Write a protein that binds this ligand. Structure first.
Ligand SMILES: [Cl-]
Ligand SMILES: [Cl-]
Length: 344
């Protein structure tokens, strides 16, 4: 029983790598990163999880990301401190040329998308869990390859463009707050393309079916619910399980703190209705800007001018945290709110 830790990028190529890897590994935890700070955070998370595991065989798999020399050095050095740990990086970005030729585990091929590199590496070394799936999995891989390298003649090119936009626009589950549910959703949507690959007009057929499919994958009923209520309902349900970690206290009022969620009017109104014990909702983004909402039980205009140099209305307001310190660790973000609220 070998434990796989799979870190990948966030676009179609990045998530398709993880569709592929889940076809091979019964014991796998996935991670995603966009830019460099997030990549380092995920590498720390992965090494931390491996240090705390009780298993003995491990594979660190990194796809569709390039590391700078310092992060590649850190990875190599860290796994030789105080367990059998294999590492394989698969990528196609020419920016990593120098780093690739300094590490035997760092593999660069600029002529293929990362998903195809992952597939051929895993297929050479591991049995696919369900050998019937190959008849749709290899076409799906090739489709991703064709659009990623923009081969207008390659198999599945036009359908792949639909899938690329699908991945970009399936943002109904905030990635920071709901990392696993965000990945499951996108991967469910991408896998459903297997029911279109062999249609005569696959690109258009999938393109026109996707919206209804998204509503269903989010747990909604597309015949009686709008997308904006399906998305906010799916998110609030996931937020309701986080009440103890995300609770913050301003004077005598209790609030719920989220991060990077953006436009929160529908979301917060629904959360506060379903959870009447909360007085306000507060979301912060990476630049320190703050959105506050209430349902009559907390003047968030007064709150944000006491705490965030801001203003608005009794039930909706904004502001900013000067010197706010971005992070991919939710506790780090919460401590910053707590410190502000503590003197309030
Ligand atoms: Cl969280
Ligand atoms: Cl809870």
């Amino acid at each position: 029983h070998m434990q796989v830790y799979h870190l990948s990028h966030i676009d179609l190529d990045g998530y398709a790598c993880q569709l592929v890897s889940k076809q091979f590994f019964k014991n796998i935890q996935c991670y995603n990163a966009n830019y460099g700070r997030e990549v380092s955070a995920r590498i720390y998370e992965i090494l931390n999880a491996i240090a705390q595991s009780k298993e003995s065989e491990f594979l660190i798999l990194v796809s569709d990301l390039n590391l700078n020399l310092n992060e590649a050095e850190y990875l190599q050095d860290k796994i030789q401190e105080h367990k059998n740990i294999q590492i394989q990086l698969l990528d196609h970005h020419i920016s990593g040329k120098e780093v690739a030729e300094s590490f035997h585990w760092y593999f660069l091929d600029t002529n293929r998308c990362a998903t195809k590199i992952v597939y051929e590496f895993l297929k050479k070394h591991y049995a696919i869990l369900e050998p019937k799936n190959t008849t749709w999995l290899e076409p799906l891989v090739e489709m991703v390859n064709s659009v990623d390298i923009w081969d207008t003649q390659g198999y599945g090119f036009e359908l792949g463009k639909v899938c690329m936009r699908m991945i970009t626009q399936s943002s109904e589950l905030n990635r920071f707050m709901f990392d696993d549910e965000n990945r499951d959703y996108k991967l469910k949507l991408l896998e459903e393309v297997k029911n279109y690959l062999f249609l005569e007009n696959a690109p258009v057929a999938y393109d026109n079916d996707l919206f209804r499919l998204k509503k269903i994958a989010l747990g909604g009923d597309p015949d009686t619910e709008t997308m904006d209520n399906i998305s906010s309902n799916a998110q609030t349900h996931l937020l309701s399980l986080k009440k103890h970690d995300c609770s913050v206290y301003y004077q005598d009022k209790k609030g719920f703190l989220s991060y990077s969620m953006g436009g929160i009017s529908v979301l917060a109104n629904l959360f506060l209705t379903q959870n009447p014990d909360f007085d306000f909702y507060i979301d912060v983004n990476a630049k320190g800007n703050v959105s506050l909402r209430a349902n009559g039980n907390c003047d968030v205009c007064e709150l944000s001018q006491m705490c965030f140099n801001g203003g608005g209305h009794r039930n909706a307001s904004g502001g900013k945290i000067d010197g706010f310190r971005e992070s991919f660790n939710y506790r780090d973000i919460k401590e910053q709110i707590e410190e502000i609220f503590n003197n309030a």
